[PDB]
RNA sequence: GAAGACCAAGGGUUCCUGUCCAACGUUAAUCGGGGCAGGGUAAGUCGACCCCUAAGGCGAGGCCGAAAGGCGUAGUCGAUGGGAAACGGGUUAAUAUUCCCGUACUUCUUACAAUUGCGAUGGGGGGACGGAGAAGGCUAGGUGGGCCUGGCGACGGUUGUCCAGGUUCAAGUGCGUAGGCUUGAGAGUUAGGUAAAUCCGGCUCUCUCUAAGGCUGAGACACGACGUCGAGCACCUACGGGUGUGAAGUCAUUGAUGCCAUGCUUCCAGGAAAAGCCUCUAAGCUUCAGAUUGUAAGGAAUCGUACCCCAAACCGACACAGGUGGUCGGGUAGAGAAUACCAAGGCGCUUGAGAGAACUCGGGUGAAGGAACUAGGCAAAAUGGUACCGUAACUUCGGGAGAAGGUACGCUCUCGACGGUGAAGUCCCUCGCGGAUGGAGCUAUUGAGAGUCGCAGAUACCAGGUGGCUGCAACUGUUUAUUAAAAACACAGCACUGUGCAAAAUCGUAAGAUGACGUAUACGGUGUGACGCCUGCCCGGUGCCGGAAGGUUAAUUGAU
């Protein structure tokens, strides 16, 4: 049965990637939040 | 011509086709084609702003001379052509200086016919004069609302306006709606009616034929749930349970929505 | 224009390997571990200058480093760029 | 037509080798996609990068918005599309169109020579494209003959009309064929292509106009290739190898869903864009610089390249009966990519061994009966092919219809009738990849008669049950992912209604959008729902439309 995760790298990057996060105010808020939390991985 | 399809299948039984032999079978005139992507009735927000639009065949936009300001120089109809972007057919005209263009093909006009624009242009089909230079009573099409702007009124297959009166810098036209309106006499109009009047005699015959024209199906309000439409809801078939309204509550069946006021001075009689 | 400093940084070490040995014996090809930045032109220059040989061809690949577990902490080894350098016939290194 | 072989994605060392067997592995494990160590991915030509753009994203200024921001111009990104170029063989434990051998091709830079108007962000052209259908021509592949090598039979027979195996090779270059498209040639000219143009478009004169020139072009043929491959032998054992040397290598037939073909015909729903590319000039440069053609010399980087991909490596928590795009598709039978049995190749599904109770599951058969079962023939059983014969009501004249229901069907022989291909030879040549002409050979189709075996010849697998009456919905479609597929939705058709274009309507505070590069034969909303016959009465209510006289009535005003 087709399950929900049908990964493509390009779609992962364009949605959740660093340059995508950095493009928007609220994305930067996420990166800053994760950077404050101490998260090793800021982006996907 | 009008051809009824023989009922060799359901889906063909009730097809009536307009088949014009005079239309050019080959490819259109490439210099006057532009790309014409479809929007599925979505706007710049990506939202469906107009329902029931989607799909259909890829077609190039043909660039029509609705302005018709190439005065003096006669032009001969090379061929009539199917235009996917409108109901009327388009004529490919050749100017004596070797410019080609597309015009809306008037009723009785066929390959070989000569069309001309300007004040001197003879009062024959396909010719474009300023409406001040067009005799009262004459039928015209591709009528300009603003001088120089290009024809906007009477462009649909079989359409035409009649010049009813001329007083000063305005002529009164009667549009196919039945509305009488003033238009500035300086504005151009082309003599005679748009061709392809048989367009209205076609019968698509089947669901898919509408889908080929990029129209998606229309669900009635009465078979939705109340959250979806004011006519939603009920047990069993209902009539909506209320005065007919649009999906957004707007009264249908009579409620007039014209609110211009800027342009009311130009409207002489309404279509009613 | 490859400087001598560049030439002295490009070749990191010879590569010792059954495959490397075969290459040398059979196809007169010396396999080096070159710097990651090294380009086939820089590698040819370096091999010519530092070994006084005439190079026919340079083929390069990068081997991506192995992940290793090392008890609790996983970690990757470093990527190595190797250069298969074919000497012209008669030349020995 | 996969449980084989590849590729993309996705994963990420799972690949190969040595070693280990605790845990992992539904058992054990010497084994492993497990642990540990080492090794392994070689490119001008594949892909990325790159040039180009689609949807769309972002967007200098801009427009708009309390702020945040939104929208959007010029731009700039964005493939799933366009744009240069490599094949055959060999080689590793593990890569190979990447290494090697053989033999190619593309493109750029520099220098030089000879010709020489060069020049774009602009003009024109080109690139450049739909669905369906069909005929033709090919090729791969198949099959047979011939050829070469080997064989001469575990049990009767097997020197043959016998058996088995083999019978290799491309890009590229030349050539320019089947097929496809297009009249050419020379003058003179110009209301056009934002300016220019020698280019394109237009006009005029002659000439030619089944033609013959050009363009395109599968495949053939030659070269590539006296190379390579090749059964077989020689030859070392370490017993694994290694090298060495190697026969024949043709013809016919069949024939793709591959190629000619981005073709041709036809249809309506009318079929990307942009660049590379060709050409034209402009500004600008004119011993120049540039351009063209040639000849040398040099370059063509960088990143990916292992491995898995009908999966124990991806998505499903699992070594999970699920899901996962593309390519390739041999033999016999067959319409076939169905089905059966096989090939190449790959597997026996990571607990086994016994036993032969009930009962459960999945199957086989069944006396007599035959729906009496049951809510209900649920399930089973049955039908099942081809050719011919024959086929009712009804009908919108298409249907209904495969209605229904019959007959034949294997094999052997005899007499027949025929299709395709086309050798030699012959003859014209406008002498070549050319025409007739000819029928050898090869291969296919089919009729009739006679016979013969069996319970049975569509023998297996495969493969409609049918008919009668009736409700509902015209019909093909759609739907409650995971208890509802329907009479529900849609639908063509119908009607009302809005909407005159800065349209109505919708998204949005706005700008701006869609509507539509549309214009009343259009667009939106509402209902009805093919088609036929029709669609009555009521305008009190409530809508909506119209009317304005009067009455009532807000802000406002401010008399008293």
């Amino acid at each position: 049965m087709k399950r929900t995760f049908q990964p493509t790298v390009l779609k992962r990057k364009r949605t959740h990637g660093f340059r995508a996060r950095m493009a928007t105010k609220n994305g930067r808020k996420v990166i800053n939040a994760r950077r404050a939390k101490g998260r090793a991985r800021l982006s996907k | 011509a009008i051809v009824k399809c023989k009922p060799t299948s359901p889906g063909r039984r009730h097809v009536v086709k307009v088949v014009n032999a005079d239309l050019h079978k080959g490819k259109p005139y490439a210099p006057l084609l532009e790309k014409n992507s479809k929007n599925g009735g979505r706007n710049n927000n990506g939202r469906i702003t107009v329902r029931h639009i989607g799909g259909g065949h890829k077609h190039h936009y043909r660039v029509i001379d609705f302005k018709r300001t190439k005065d003096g120089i006669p032009a001969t109809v090379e061929r009539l052509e199917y235009d996917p972007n409108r109901s009327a057919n388009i004529a490919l005209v050749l100017y004596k200086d070797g410019e080609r263009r597309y015009i809306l093909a008037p009723k009785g006009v066929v390959a070989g016919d000569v069309v001309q624009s300007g004040v001197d242009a003879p009062i024959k089909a396909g010719n474009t004069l300023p409406m001040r230079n067009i005799p009262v009573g004459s039928t015209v099409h591709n009528v300009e609302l603003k001088p120089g702007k290009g024809g906007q009124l009477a462009r649909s297959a079989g359409a035409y306006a009649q010049i009813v009166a001329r007083d000063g810098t305005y002529v009164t036209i009667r549009l196919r709606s039945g509305e009488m309106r003033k238009v500035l006499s300086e504005g151009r109009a082309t003599i005679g009616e748009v061709g392809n009047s048989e367009h209205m005699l076609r019968e698509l015959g089947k669901a898919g034929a509408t889908r080929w024209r990029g129209v998606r199906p229309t669900v009635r309000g009465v078979v939705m749930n109340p959250v979806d439409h004011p006519h939603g809801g009920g047990e069993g078939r209902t009539s909506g349970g209320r005065h007919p309204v649009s999906p957004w509550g707007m009264p249908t069946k009579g409620y007039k929505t014209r609110k211009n006021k800027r342009t009311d001075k130009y409207i002489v009689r309404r279509r009613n | 224009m490859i400087t001598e400093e560049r030439i002295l940084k490009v070749l990191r070490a010879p590569h010792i390997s059954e495959k490397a040995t075969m290459a040398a014996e059979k196809a007169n090809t010396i396999v080096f571990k070159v710097a990651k930045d090294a380009t086939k032109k820089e590698i040819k220059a370096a091999v010519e200058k530092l070994f006084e040989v005439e190079v026919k061809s340079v083929n390069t690949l990068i081997t991506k480093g192995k992940t290793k577990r090392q008890g609790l902490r996983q970690g990757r080894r470093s990527d190595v760029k190797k250069a298969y350098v074919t000497l012209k016939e008669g030349q020995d290194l």
Side-chain angles (χ1 to χ4, degrees), chain B residues 51 60-61 82 86 152 156-157 177 179 257-258 271:
Chain B
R51 293 152 63 219
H60 301 299
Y61 182 72
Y82 172 88
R86 66 190 58 274
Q152 294 183 266
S156 187
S177 59
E179 194 189 64
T257 64
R258 168 186 180 67
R271 64 176 186 282

Short mmCIF file of all heavy atoms in Angstrom, two decimals, chain B residues 51 60-61 82 86 152 156-157 177 179 257-258 271, chain D residues 201 270-272 490 499-500 504 517-519 521 525:
data_model
loop_
_atom_site.label_atom_id
_atom_site.label_comp_id
_atom_site.label_asym_id
_atom_site.label_seq_id
_atom_site.Cartn_x
_atom_site.Cartn_y
_atom_site.Cartn_z
N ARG B 51 -15.15 29.12 -10.35
CA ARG B 51 -15.38 27.68 -10.31
C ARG B 51 -15.52 27.13 -11.73
O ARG B 51 -15.92 27.85 -12.65
CB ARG B 51 -16.65 27.30 -9.54
CG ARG B 51 -16.46 27.62 -8.07
CD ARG B 51 -17.74 27.93 -7.38
NE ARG B 51 -18.72 26.85 -7.32
CZ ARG B 51 -20.02 27.03 -7.46
NH1 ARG B 51 -20.49 27.88 -8.34
NH2 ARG B 51 -20.88 26.22 -6.84
N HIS B 60 -2.51 27.62 -28.70
CA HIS B 60 -1.78 28.87 -28.78
C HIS B 60 -2.78 30.01 -28.93
O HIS B 60 -3.81 29.81 -29.55
CB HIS B 60 -0.85 28.89 -29.98
CG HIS B 60 0.16 27.82 -30.00
ND1 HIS B 60 1.11 27.67 -29.02
CD2 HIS B 60 0.40 26.87 -30.92
CE1 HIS B 60 1.88 26.64 -29.33
NE2 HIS B 60 1.46 26.14 -30.49
N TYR B 61 -2.48 31.17 -28.32
CA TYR B 61 -3.25 32.38 -28.55
C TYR B 61 -2.88 32.96 -29.91
O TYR B 61 -1.71 33.05 -30.20
CB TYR B 61 -2.94 33.42 -27.50
CG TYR B 61 -3.75 34.69 -27.68
CD1 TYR B 61 -5.09 34.70 -27.39
CD2 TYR B 61 -3.17 35.85 -28.14
CE1 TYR B 61 -5.86 35.84 -27.56
CE2 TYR B 61 -3.91 37.01 -28.27
CZ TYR B 61 -5.27 36.99 -28.01
OH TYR B 61 -6.07 38.07 -28.22
N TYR B 82 -9.69 28.28 -37.92
CA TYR B 82 -10.24 27.99 -36.61
C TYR B 82 -9.37 28.68 -35.57
O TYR B 82 -8.15 28.62 -35.66
CB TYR B 82 -10.29 26.48 -36.46
CG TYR B 82 -10.65 25.98 -35.09
CD1 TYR B 82 -11.94 25.80 -34.74
CD2 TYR B 82 -9.67 25.67 -34.16
CE1 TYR B 82 -12.30 25.36 -33.48
CE2 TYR B 82 -10.01 25.22 -32.90
CZ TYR B 82 -11.33 25.06 -32.56
OH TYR B 82 -11.72 24.59 -31.35
N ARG B 86 -11.53 31.58 -29.14
CA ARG B 86 -12.80 32.31 -29.23
C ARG B 86 -13.80 31.54 -30.08
O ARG B 86 -13.42 30.60 -30.78
CB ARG B 86 -12.56 33.65 -29.91
CG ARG B 86 -12.16 33.50 -31.38
CD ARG B 86 -11.69 34.78 -32.04
NE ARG B 86 -10.55 35.38 -31.36
CZ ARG B 86 -10.59 36.20 -30.34
NH1 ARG B 86 -11.74 36.81 -30.00
NH2 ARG B 86 -9.49 36.42 -29.65
N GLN B 152 -14.15 46.05 -28.62
CA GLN B 152 -14.49 45.30 -27.43
C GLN B 152 -15.89 44.68 -27.49
O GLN B 152 -16.13 43.68 -26.81
CB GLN B 152 -14.36 46.18 -26.21
CG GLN B 152 -12.95 46.61 -25.95
CD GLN B 152 -12.84 47.42 -24.69
OE1 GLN B 152 -12.89 48.65 -24.72
NE2 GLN B 152 -12.77 46.72 -23.58
N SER B 156 -18.31 38.00 -30.54
CA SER B 156 -18.63 36.60 -30.44
C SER B 156 -19.19 36.14 -31.77
O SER B 156 -19.72 36.93 -32.54
CB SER B 156 -19.60 36.35 -29.32
OG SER B 156 -19.81 34.97 -29.09
N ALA B 157 -19.06 34.85 -32.04
CA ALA B 157 -19.61 34.26 -33.23
C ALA B 157 -21.07 34.69 -33.38
O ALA B 157 -21.85 34.55 -32.45
CB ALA B 157 -19.47 32.79 -33.15
N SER B 177 -27.39 42.11 -26.45
CA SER B 177 -28.16 42.07 -25.22
C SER B 177 -29.54 42.70 -25.42
O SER B 177 -30.48 42.31 -24.74
CB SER B 177 -27.41 42.74 -24.08
OG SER B 177 -27.11 44.09 -24.37
N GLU B 179 -29.43 46.05 -24.99
CA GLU B 179 -29.02 47.32 -24.42
C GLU B 179 -28.73 48.32 -25.53
O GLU B 179 -28.10 47.97 -26.51
CB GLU B 179 -27.74 47.20 -23.63
CG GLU B 179 -27.49 48.42 -22.75
CD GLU B 179 -26.12 48.40 -22.12
OE1 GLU B 179 -25.16 48.47 -22.92
OE2 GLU B 179 -26.00 48.31 -20.86
N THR B 257 -26.97 43.11 -10.05
CA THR B 257 -25.67 43.28 -9.40
C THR B 257 -24.85 44.40 -10.08
O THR B 257 -23.71 44.62 -9.66
CB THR B 257 -24.86 41.97 -9.37
OG1 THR B 257 -24.52 41.53 -10.68
CG2 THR B 257 -25.53 40.83 -8.65
N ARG B 258 -25.37 45.06 -11.11
CA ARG B 258 -24.66 46.16 -11.76
C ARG B 258 -24.60 47.32 -10.79
O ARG B 258 -25.64 47.76 -10.32
CB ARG B 258 -25.32 46.73 -13.03
CG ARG B 258 -24.73 48.04 -13.55
CD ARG B 258 -25.51 48.64 -14.70
NE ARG B 258 -24.89 49.89 -15.15
CZ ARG B 258 -23.69 50.03 -15.73
NH1 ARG B 258 -23.01 49.00 -16.15
NH2 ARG B 258 -23.25 51.22 -16.03
N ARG B 271 -31.10 46.21 -21.15
CA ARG B 271 -31.41 45.06 -22.00
C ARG B 271 -32.86 44.58 -21.77
O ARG B 271 -33.51 44.05 -22.69
CB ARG B 271 -30.40 43.93 -21.76
CG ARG B 271 -30.43 43.35 -20.35
CD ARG B 271 -29.47 42.20 -20.25
NE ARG B 271 -29.59 41.54 -18.95
CZ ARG B 271 -29.09 41.98 -17.81
NH1 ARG B 271 -28.23 43.00 -17.78
NH2 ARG B 271 -29.41 41.37 -16.68
P G D 201 9.82 34.96 -47.86
OP1 G D 201 9.03 33.70 -47.89
OP2 G D 201 10.61 35.33 -49.07
"O5'" G D 201 8.81 36.15 -47.55
"C5'" G D 201 7.82 35.96 -46.52
"C4'" G D 201 6.90 37.15 -46.48
"O4'" G D 201 7.63 38.31 -46.00
"C3'" G D 201 6.33 37.61 -47.82
"O3'" G D 201 5.22 36.83 -48.18
"C2'" G D 201 5.98 39.06 -47.53
"O2'" G D 201 4.78 39.20 -46.82
"C1'" G D 201 7.20 39.46 -46.70
N9 G D 201 8.29 39.93 -47.53
C8 G D 201 9.46 39.30 -47.83
N7 G D 201 10.25 40.01 -48.61
C5 G D 201 9.52 41.16 -48.85
C6 G D 201 9.83 42.27 -49.67
O6 G D 201 10.86 42.47 -50.33
N1 G D 201 8.79 43.19 -49.69
C2 G D 201 7.63 43.09 -48.96
N2 G D 201 6.76 44.11 -49.04
N3 G D 201 7.33 42.04 -48.21
C4 G D 201 8.31 41.12 -48.21
P G D 270 -9.06 23.45 -29.07
OP1 G D 270 -8.41 23.90 -27.80
OP2 G D 270 -10.14 24.29 -29.65
"O5'" G D 270 -7.97 23.13 -30.18
"C5'" G D 270 -6.76 22.54 -29.72
"C4'" G D 270 -5.74 22.54 -30.83
"O4'" G D 270 -6.28 21.86 -31.97
"C3'" G D 270 -5.28 23.90 -31.34
"O3'" G D 270 -3.91 23.76 -31.73
"C2'" G D 270 -6.19 24.14 -32.54
"O2'" G D 270 -5.54 24.93 -33.51
"C1'" G D 270 -6.38 22.72 -33.07
N9 G D 270 -7.68 22.50 -33.67
C8 G D 270 -8.82 22.10 -33.02
N7 G D 270 -9.85 21.97 -33.82
C5 G D 270 -9.36 22.31 -35.06
C6 G D 270 -10.01 22.35 -36.30
O6 G D 270 -11.20 22.11 -36.53
N1 G D 270 -9.18 22.82 -37.31
C2 G D 270 -7.84 23.07 -37.16
N2 G D 270 -7.16 23.41 -38.27
N3 G D 270 -7.20 23.00 -35.99
C4 G D 270 -8.03 22.66 -34.98
P G D 271 -2.91 25.01 -31.81
OP1 G D 271 -3.39 26.12 -30.95
OP2 G D 271 -2.50 25.30 -33.21
"O5'" G D 271 -1.68 24.27 -31.13
"C5'" G D 271 -1.72 23.94 -29.78
"C4'" G D 271 -1.14 22.58 -29.59
"O4'" G D 271 -2.08 21.60 -30.06
"C3'" G D 271 0.13 22.28 -30.37
"O3'" G D 271 1.26 22.79 -29.69
"C2'" G D 271 0.10 20.76 -30.41
"O2'" G D 271 0.51 20.19 -29.19
"C1'" G D 271 -1.39 20.50 -30.61
N9 G D 271 -1.82 20.40 -31.97
C8 G D 271 -1.19 20.89 -33.07
N7 G D 271 -1.90 20.78 -34.17
C5 G D 271 -3.11 20.27 -33.73
C6 G D 271 -4.28 19.97 -34.45
O6 G D 271 -4.47 20.07 -35.67
N1 G D 271 -5.24 19.42 -33.64
C2 G D 271 -5.15 19.26 -32.29
N2 G D 271 -6.24 18.81 -31.66
N3 G D 271 -4.07 19.58 -31.59
C4 G D 271 -3.07 20.04 -32.38
P A D 272 2.60 23.06 -30.52
OP1 A D 272 2.26 23.95 -31.67
OP2 A D 272 3.30 21.78 -30.81
"O5'" A D 272 3.51 23.83 -29.49
"C5'" A D 272 4.05 23.13 -28.38
"C4'" A D 272 4.09 24.09 -27.22
"O4'" A D 272 4.42 23.37 -26.04
"C3'" A D 272 5.15 25.17 -27.29
"O3'" A D 272 4.70 26.33 -27.93
"C2'" A D 272 5.31 25.54 -25.83
"O2'" A D 272 4.32 26.38 -25.29
"C1'" A D 272 5.21 24.18 -25.21
N9 A D 272 6.46 23.52 -25.05
C8 A D 272 6.92 22.47 -25.78
N7 A D 272 8.05 22.02 -25.35
C5 A D 272 8.35 22.82 -24.26
C6 A D 272 9.40 22.79 -23.35
N6 A D 272 10.44 21.98 -23.51
N1 A D 272 9.43 23.76 -22.40
C2 A D 272 8.42 24.65 -22.37
N3 A D 272 7.31 24.69 -23.11
C4 A D 272 7.36 23.76 -24.07
P A D 490 -24.75 16.81 -9.48
OP1 A D 490 -24.74 18.30 -9.44
OP2 A D 490 -26.04 16.15 -9.83
"O5'" A D 490 -23.66 16.30 -10.52
"C5'" A D 490 -22.32 16.89 -10.46
"C4'" A D 490 -21.50 16.37 -11.63
"O4'" A D 490 -21.33 14.94 -11.52
"C3'" A D 490 -22.15 16.58 -12.99
"O3'" A D 490 -21.72 17.82 -13.53
"C2'" A D 490 -21.58 15.42 -13.80
"O2'" A D 490 -20.28 15.63 -14.27
"C1'" A D 490 -21.57 14.33 -12.76
N9 A D 490 -22.80 13.56 -12.72
C8 A D 490 -23.80 13.61 -11.80
N7 A D 490 -24.67 12.64 -11.93
C5 A D 490 -24.25 11.95 -13.03
C6 A D 490 -24.78 10.83 -13.70
N6 A D 490 -25.88 10.21 -13.35
N1 A D 490 -24.13 10.40 -14.81
C2 A D 490 -22.97 11.01 -15.13
N3 A D 490 -22.36 12.03 -14.55
C4 A D 490 -23.09 12.50 -13.52
P U D 499 -27.48 42.89 -13.86
OP1 U D 499 -27.51 44.16 -13.08
OP2 U D 499 -28.49 42.71 -14.93
"O5'" U D 499 -26.14 42.66 -14.68
"C5'" U D 499 -24.91 42.74 -13.99
"C4'" U D 499 -23.81 42.19 -14.86
"O4'" U D 499 -24.01 40.78 -15.11
"C3'" U D 499 -23.71 42.76 -16.26
"O3'" U D 499 -23.08 44.03 -16.23
"C2'" U D 499 -22.81 41.72 -16.89
"O2'" U D 499 -21.48 41.72 -16.39
"C1'" U D 499 -23.44 40.45 -16.35
N1 U D 499 -24.46 39.92 -17.27
C2 U D 499 -24.00 39.22 -18.35
O2 U D 499 -22.81 39.03 -18.54
N3 U D 499 -24.96 38.71 -19.16
C4 U D 499 -26.31 38.86 -19.04
O4 U D 499 -27.06 38.37 -19.88
C5 U D 499 -26.71 39.57 -17.88
C6 U D 499 -25.79 40.08 -17.06
P G D 500 -23.72 45.29 -16.98
OP1 G D 500 -23.33 46.44 -16.13
OP2 G D 500 -25.15 45.09 -17.33
"O5'" G D 500 -22.94 45.26 -18.36
"C5'" G D 500 -21.51 45.47 -18.37
"C4'" G D 500 -21.19 46.25 -19.61
"O4'" G D 500 -21.61 45.46 -20.74
"C3'" G D 500 -21.91 47.60 -19.77
"O3'" G D 500 -21.03 48.61 -20.23
"C2'" G D 500 -22.91 47.34 -20.89
"O2'" G D 500 -23.12 48.47 -21.71
"C1'" G D 500 -22.18 46.29 -21.70
N9 G D 500 -23.00 45.48 -22.58
C8 G D 500 -24.36 45.43 -22.64
N7 G D 500 -24.80 44.55 -23.50
C5 G D 500 -23.66 44.03 -24.07
C6 G D 500 -23.51 43.08 -25.10
O6 G D 500 -24.42 42.50 -25.71
N1 G D 500 -22.17 42.83 -25.39
C2 G D 500 -21.10 43.43 -24.76
N2 G D 500 -19.86 43.07 -25.12
N3 G D 500 -21.25 44.31 -23.78
C4 G D 500 -22.54 44.57 -23.50
P A D 504 -18.17 44.58 -12.24
OP1 A D 504 -18.60 45.74 -11.40
OP2 A D 504 -16.80 44.01 -12.05
"O5'" A D 504 -19.19 43.40 -12.02
"C5'" A D 504 -20.55 43.68 -11.73
"C4'" A D 504 -21.32 42.41 -11.93
"O4'" A D 504 -20.91 41.81 -13.19
"C3'" A D 504 -21.01 41.32 -10.93
"O3'" A D 504 -21.77 41.51 -9.78
"C2'" A D 504 -21.43 40.08 -11.68
"O2'" A D 504 -22.84 39.90 -11.72
"C1'" A D 504 -20.90 40.41 -13.06
N9 A D 504 -19.57 39.91 -13.30
C8 A D 504 -18.38 40.54 -13.05
N7 A D 504 -17.34 39.85 -13.46
C5 A D 504 -17.88 38.71 -14.02
C6 A D 504 -17.29 37.60 -14.66
N6 A D 504 -15.99 37.44 -14.83
N1 A D 504 -18.12 36.64 -15.12
C2 A D 504 -19.44 36.82 -15.00
N3 A D 504 -20.10 37.83 -14.43
C4 A D 504 -19.26 38.74 -13.93
P C D 517 -7.19 33.86 -21.64
OP1 C D 517 -8.03 32.97 -22.53
OP2 C D 517 -6.37 33.22 -20.56
"O5'" C D 517 -6.20 34.71 -22.56
"C5'" C D 517 -6.71 35.25 -23.78
"C4'" C D 517 -7.02 36.69 -23.59
"O4'" C D 517 -5.90 37.35 -22.96
"C3'" C D 517 -7.24 37.49 -24.87
"O3'" C D 517 -8.59 37.43 -25.21
"C2'" C D 517 -6.85 38.90 -24.48
"O2'" C D 517 -7.88 39.60 -23.81
"C1'" C D 517 -5.69 38.62 -23.52
N1 C D 517 -4.38 38.62 -24.21
C2 C D 517 -3.78 39.85 -24.46
O2 C D 517 -4.36 40.89 -24.10
N3 C D 517 -2.57 39.88 -25.06
C4 C D 517 -1.98 38.74 -25.43
N4 C D 517 -0.80 38.83 -26.03
C5 C D 517 -2.59 37.48 -25.21
C6 C D 517 -3.78 37.47 -24.61
P G D 518 -9.13 38.22 -26.46
OP1 G D 518 -8.44 37.77 -27.70
OP2 G D 518 -9.19 39.68 -26.18
"O5'" G D 518 -10.58 37.58 -26.44
"C5'" G D 518 -10.70 36.13 -26.41
"C4'" G D 518 -11.87 35.78 -25.55
"O4'" G D 518 -11.53 35.95 -24.15
"C3'" G D 518 -13.13 36.63 -25.72
"O3'" G D 518 -13.90 36.12 -26.78
"C2'" G D 518 -13.82 36.36 -24.41
"O2'" G D 518 -14.38 35.06 -24.42
"C1'" G D 518 -12.64 36.47 -23.46
N9 G D 518 -12.33 37.84 -23.04
C8 G D 518 -11.11 38.46 -23.11
N7 G D 518 -11.11 39.65 -22.57
C5 G D 518 -12.41 39.81 -22.11
C6 G D 518 -12.99 40.90 -21.42
O6 G D 518 -12.47 41.98 -21.10
N1 G D 518 -14.31 40.64 -21.09
C2 G D 518 -14.99 39.50 -21.40
N2 G D 518 -16.26 39.42 -20.98
N3 G D 518 -14.43 38.46 -22.00
C4 G D 518 -13.15 38.70 -22.35
P U D 519 -14.75 37.10 -27.70
OP1 U D 519 -15.75 36.36 -28.52
OP2 U D 519 -13.71 37.93 -28.40
"O5'" U D 519 -15.57 37.94 -26.65
"C5'" U D 519 -16.72 37.34 -26.03
"C4'" U D 519 -17.56 38.45 -25.48
"O4'" U D 519 -16.76 39.26 -24.59
"C3'" U D 519 -18.11 39.41 -26.54
"O3'" U D 519 -19.45 39.75 -26.30
"C2'" U D 519 -17.23 40.65 -26.40
"O2'" U D 519 -17.90 41.84 -26.73
"C1'" U D 519 -16.97 40.60 -24.90
N1 U D 519 -15.78 41.37 -24.53
C2 U D 519 -15.96 42.57 -23.85
O2 U D 519 -17.04 42.99 -23.44
N3 U D 519 -14.82 43.27 -23.63
C4 U D 519 -13.55 42.91 -23.97
O4 U D 519 -12.63 43.67 -23.70
C5 U D 519 -13.45 41.70 -24.72
C6 U D 519 -14.55 40.98 -24.96
P U D 521 -25.87 36.22 -27.71
OP1 U D 521 -25.94 36.93 -29.02
OP2 U D 521 -27.10 35.65 -27.10
"O5'" U D 521 -24.75 35.11 -27.87
"C5'" U D 521 -24.64 34.05 -26.92
"C4'" U D 521 -23.97 32.90 -27.60
"O4'" U D 521 -24.66 32.67 -28.85
"C3'" U D 521 -22.49 33.10 -27.99
"O3'" U D 521 -21.74 31.91 -27.96
"C2'" U D 521 -22.60 33.56 -29.45
"O2'" U D 521 -21.43 33.34 -30.19
"C1'" U D 521 -23.73 32.64 -29.89
N1 U D 521 -24.38 33.05 -31.14
C2 U D 521 -24.16 32.27 -32.26
O2 U D 521 -23.38 31.32 -32.27
N3 U D 521 -24.81 32.70 -33.38
C4 U D 521 -25.64 33.78 -33.51
O4 U D 521 -26.16 34.01 -34.60
C5 U D 521 -25.84 34.51 -32.31
C6 U D 521 -25.21 34.13 -31.19
P G D 525 -20.27 29.72 -11.27
OP1 G D 525 -19.47 29.38 -10.05
OP2 G D 525 -20.37 28.70 -12.38
"O5'" G D 525 -21.67 30.29 -10.83
"C5'" G D 525 -21.72 30.90 -9.53
"C4'" G D 525 -23.12 31.29 -9.24
"O4'" G D 525 -23.63 32.08 -10.33
"C3'" G D 525 -24.14 30.16 -9.14
"O3'" G D 525 -24.11 29.48 -7.92
"C2'" G D 525 -25.37 31.00 -9.22
"O2'" G D 525 -25.40 31.66 -7.98
"C1'" G D 525 -25.02 31.90 -10.41
N9 G D 525 -25.35 31.35 -11.71
C8 G D 525 -24.48 30.90 -12.67
N7 G D 525 -25.07 30.47 -13.77
C5 G D 525 -26.42 30.69 -13.52
C6 G D 525 -27.56 30.47 -14.35
O6 G D 525 -27.61 29.98 -15.48
N1 G D 525 -28.73 30.82 -13.72
C2 G D 525 -28.83 31.36 -12.48
N2 G D 525 -30.07 31.67 -12.07
N3 G D 525 -27.76 31.62 -11.70
C4 G D 525 -26.60 31.27 -12.29
#
